[PDB]
Amino acid sequence: ALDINSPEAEKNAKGARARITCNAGNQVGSAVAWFNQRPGDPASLLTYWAATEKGVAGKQSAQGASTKFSMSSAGPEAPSLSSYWCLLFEKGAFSFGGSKLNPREGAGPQASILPPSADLNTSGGAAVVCFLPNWYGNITVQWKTEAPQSQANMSWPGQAGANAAYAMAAVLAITKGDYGPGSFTCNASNRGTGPFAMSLN
Amino acid sequence: SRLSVCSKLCYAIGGAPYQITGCAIGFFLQIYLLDVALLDPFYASIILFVGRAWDAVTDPTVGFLVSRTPWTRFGRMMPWIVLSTPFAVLCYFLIWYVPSVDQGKVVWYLIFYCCFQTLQTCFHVPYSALTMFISTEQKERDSATAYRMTVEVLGTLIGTAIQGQIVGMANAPCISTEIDLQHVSLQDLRNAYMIASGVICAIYVVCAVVLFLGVKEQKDTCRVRTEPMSFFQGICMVMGHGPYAKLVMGFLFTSLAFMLLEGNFALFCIYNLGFRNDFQNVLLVIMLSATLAIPFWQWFLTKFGKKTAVYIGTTSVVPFLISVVLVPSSLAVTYIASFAAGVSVAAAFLLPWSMLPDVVDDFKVQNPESQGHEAIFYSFYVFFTKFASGVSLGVSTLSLDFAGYVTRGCTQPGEVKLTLKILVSAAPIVLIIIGLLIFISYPINEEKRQGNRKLLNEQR
Amino acid sequence: ASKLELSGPAEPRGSKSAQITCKAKGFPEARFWVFWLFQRAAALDWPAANFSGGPVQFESRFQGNASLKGSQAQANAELNIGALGSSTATYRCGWKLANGGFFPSWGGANVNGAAGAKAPAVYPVEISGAGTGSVTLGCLVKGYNAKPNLTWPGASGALTFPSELNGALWNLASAVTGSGFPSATCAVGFGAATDVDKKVAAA
């Protein structure tokens, strides 16, 4: 197979321009197709060969001679912030790479720890939930039950339509017999030059 | 005060760059649009139809515009040639240039092949009319036409020898597909096509400079005639004659079969025969055999008459066209069939011109009043040989699109190779058989009445 | 126009076999290679291609796992998936342009190869007691095997996180940034009859 590689899985673009790059593992002879998939929709063909469009908006252009290809969105609007895929059509085994556009925002994370309720503690469980509702970038969550823990499950949404900020919920599942370790703390590490710690005892 | 050998040589050399562009386009434009320009074969069918068809249309229109050209300070035909060469070379270079257009390369190519047809038409129709202006002696015009025929055959040989050996020198990688499942670049192939087109454009210019310097028009102003598309009763008079029609329909169908072969033999050599690297050598061997078989058929039309010459000359390619699609792509079989196909090409494009003066004498015997019947016969043949070959090439590339022609490809599916076998083996044999059946219905019966018509030439 | 209509989402149970159909409209199906793709959470993969009047060509990873078939009397192309367990994905059937190798039209049908069928449990996770400005309330939905729908009575500040697998069931959480707190409740709708709405109390 041919190792088609889109390096940036996430890109930042607001209204100016976007250059989505695709590096092939082989000289493919200017045979690269560009698809656009929106969430909840199948992929739609944008470009094929070097720069040939297929019934799409004129902002989508493409370039690349061999082993390095680019798709330019010179007019990036709200529908243009979706996932894009570069495909080879040089050899029989077809391969894709994966990429996505995002807007640009500021900074500032949040954190809020929530203990298990009485209803969950009645039916043999204890889930401590750390909500991280608004931030921009990449964030990490550390759970400390007076010791590091690696039994928590994390979930992230996409980027919000209004605030243009991400979110994160981390759930720590602990049984009733293991529910005496001291205090539970949730630590958030973003680009804010310091972790934000919430705790409950 | 006749034409020198240098003036006839310059007039002859001025007709070569053309044949060169005709052989380059007619042998390599389909594979350029399909494999090098990376077009959809529907768009390639559109371009290959519209360039030839529109071309044929412009031929009588530029003939009419040339026939009303007044006498300038340089001549009646030299201003058209001189003012239309530097635009024709630009359009010819931009035919084989692949543009960086995000949508609609078909519009770019459609513009050039067609514009080139107009421009070249504006170069060639005054050039064809120049034979009536170079000299007032009919023997001088016949010697200049013989020189022109020799340099046209040589430029037919050179045009597949420069483009073929330049664009075949630098190859390109091929595109595997699902049927294929279980350092040279594409840009180097495009650069080779640009280099070949630049060499052909340099030849064009050089020969246009030679034609401008070495040929004068003598300011005769002692004759007048009609124009193309001004009248159409002469075409009905020619088509009302029996042998004239029979000859034009036979030569038509035969030229249609061999133009279909010329258009679609490059793809047959690349994919069916597995000769993606050495198809240009096969085309060069075909052109060398067609060049070397012309004195053979010139001796054959005198040794054994002309009825058997056109009966077996145009049908000698039939078992070899069966054999190329009935063997599993052997190299020696390909080369011997290339030699036989070149011999048949030389026969089919030489021997109707040997048949023609007998029909001219028969028409002079039938009609004492004759003016421009040969010119309107050749104009009718040309247009059709152009329009119907454009139809054939468009139908061929559209059938490739329907069959699922992978661009480049390294292996075509069984549907595409069957269409190539039909397009080089079924349809040209059918057109050759139809042309032979038209040649059977021939009331002139070679010289056996035509010499009696020559006695009619002694009568009038 | 040219379009491809598939079947609905399917839920095979562990090691069943799942047949995904793809009915074509607007072109002769015997002329084009009808493909079959594989979109995981990561990216797009490529199972195989099928010529409806001829051969089937597989990827080496999917030989023995996939089985492409073509019914040309019903303009239909089908993919049969054998043993599963991690083939929870979205399968497309976008056919190929006969000349190029790219896919003009496309498809989309989910496959969720898991086991179990249970009603969700709703827990009103609330604040510990501290307060500074706006309050953050929560709702934890744990232990179901379908797609839920979480709601709040006319308040638009909610973030409903994507569900995740834990064991054989799904876990989901929802957060609301509400300034004033007279009364807040969390509504959960479900495919089964589990429309339970729970109020969020203090402490």
Ligand SMILES: CC/C=C/C/C=C/C/C=C\CCCCCCCC(=O)OC[C@@H](O)COP(=O)(O)OCC[N+](C)(C)C
């Ligand atoms: C194994 C099979 C081999 C197959 C084919 C070989 C084929 C060549 C066919 C013909 C050339 C004949 C060469 C001798 C001169 C005869 C006149 C002639 O060559 O053809 C007359 C004309 O009627 C066709 O004109 P054409 O359209 O081809 O050229 C125009 C160029 N352009 C398109 C740019 C305007």
Ligand SMILES: CCCCCCCCCCCCO[C@@H]1O[C@H](CO)[C@@H](O[C@H]2O[C@H](CO)[C@@H](O)[C@H](O)[C@H]2O)[C@H](O)[C@H]1O
């Ligand atoms: C895409 C390219 C298409 C082809 C390009 C052709 C453009 C040039 C057209 C020129 C064709 C002939 O051009 C036209 O010839 C006639 C000849 O009677 C000239 O007509 C004039 O000149 C002659 C000579 O004095 C007089 O006898 C005549 O009475 C007078 O009307 C026109 O002044 C000229 O415009």
Ligand SMILES: CCCCCCCCCCCCO[C@@H]1O[C@H](CO)[C@@H](O[C@H]2O[C@H](CO)[C@@H](O)[C@H](O)[C@H]2O)[C@H](O)[C@H]1O
């Ligand atoms: C590239 C596409 C174009 C291909 C064709 C290009 C050449 C076309 C034929 C050349 C004729 C040029 O156009 C010509 O110009 C001169 C000067 O205006 C005029 O020609 C006239 O000029 C003088 C003065 O009247 C007289 O000798 C005579 O009446 C006539 O020759 C006409 O207008 C036209 O005959």
Ligand SMILES: CCCCCCCCCCCCO[C@@H]1O[C@H](CO)[C@@H](O[C@H]2O[C@H](CO)[C@@H](O)[C@H](O)[C@H]2O)[C@H](O)[C@H]1O
């Ligand atoms: C004897 C030979 C002499 C030849 C000398 C002439 C120079 C030849 C060099 C090629 C120059 C043309 O180059 C070509 O021009 C067209 C102009 O529309 C460009 O096309 C450009 O404009 C069109 C709009 O019309 C856009 O749709 C297209 O996206 C854009 O790329 C091509 O991108 C470029 O590749």
Ligand SMILES: CCCCCCCCCCCCO[C@@H]1O[C@H](CO)[C@@H](O[C@H]2O[C@H](CO)[C@@H](O)[C@H](O)[C@H]2O)[C@H](O)[C@H]1O
């Ligand atoms: C880019 C292309 C490069 C081409 C290089 C140039 C090639 C050189 C051309 C030489 C061709 C010689 O052309 C030669 O002319 C004489 C005329 O005197 C002909 O000789 C014959 O002509 C006619 C036959 O129709 C008779 O009327 C005449 O009696 C007889 O002499 C020869 O049959 C022909 O072969």
Ligand SMILES: CCCCCCCCCCCCO[C@@H]1O[C@H](CO)[C@@H](O[C@H]2O[C@H](CO)[C@@H](O)[C@H](O)[C@H]2O)[C@H](O)[C@H]1O
């Ligand atoms: C009189 C004026 C007209 C002159 C026209 C020019 C005629 C001379 C053409 C140039 C000579 C090229 O001739 C051609 O060269 C190539 C080599 O590159 C040969 O090709 C040969 O070598 C290749 C190796 O790649 C093999 O496929 C095979 O051994 C053989 O086909 C052809 O057999 C020969 O026909």
Ligand SMILES: CCCCCCCCCCCCO[C@@H]1O[C@H](CO)[C@@H](O[C@H]2O[C@H](CO)[C@@H](O)[C@H](O)[C@H]2O)[C@H](O)[C@H]1O
């Ligand atoms: C009248 C008789 C005519 C005989 C033939 C005359 C021309 C013969 C062609 C020989 C030159 C081409 O041979 C070889 O081609 C490749 C292109 O594929 C060139 O490669 C280069 O081409 C051009 C040169 O500016 C560059 O833009 C390009 O980046 C580079 O690839 C080589 O430098 C050359 O050595």
Ligand SMILES: CCCCCCCCCCCCO[C@@H]1O[C@H](CO)[C@@H](O[C@H]2O[C@H](CO)[C@@H](O)[C@H](O)[C@H]2O)[C@H](O)[C@H]1O
């Ligand atoms: C006797 C006189 C005739 C002698 C030969 C004259 C022919 C001149 C053609 C020479 C070939 C020039 O070819 C040159 O190569 C480079 C290779 O990157 C190409 O440049 C190309 O690079 C990339 C490729 O995707 C693109 O940005 C774009 O298509 C183009 O700029 C051009 O095609 C041309 O600028």
Ligand SMILES: CCCCCCCCCCCCO[C@@H]1O[C@H](CO)[C@@H](O[C@H]2O[C@H](CO)[C@@H](O)[C@H](O)[C@H]2O)[C@H](O)[C@H]1O
């Ligand atoms: C008579 C014998 C001589 C024949 C050859 C004479 C012409 C030689 C030129 C051949 C190569 C042409 O190469 C071609 O040049 C044009 C610029 O003009 C470039 O065209 C490009 O120019 C610039 C960037 O450079 C941009 O506006 C745009 O991307 C495009 O239009 C192409 O990238 C290249 O493919």
Ligand SMILES: CCCCCCCCCCCCO[C@@H]1O[C@H](CO)[C@@H](O[C@H]2O[C@H](CO)[C@@H](O)[C@H](O)[C@H]2O)[C@H](O)[C@H]1O
């Ligand atoms: C006198 C005028 C000309 C008359 C003769 C011209 C037609 C000759 C009839 C040939 C039979 C046509 O029938 C056609 O043959 C090809 C053979 O590859 C077959 O084509 C089928 O089989 C091949 C494999 O063998 C597959 O690769 C292909 O995808 C599939 O379409 C079908 O059976 C049918 O589509």
Ligand SMILES: CCCCCCCCCCCCO[C@@H]1O[C@H](CO)[C@@H](O[C@H]2O[C@H](CO)[C@@H](O)[C@H](O)[C@H]2O)[C@H](O)[C@H]1O
């Ligand atoms: C004088 C000429 C006589 C005929 C003129 C007819 C010209 C009509 C213009 C073509 C418009 C429709 O053209 C037809 O539709 C589809 C989509 O619309 C085109 O597009 C098709 O091929 C392209 C490849 O380039 C694919 O990217 C695309 O997915 C596919 O649908 C084809 O080019 C053609 O099959």
Ligand code: NA
């Ligand atoms: Na033509």
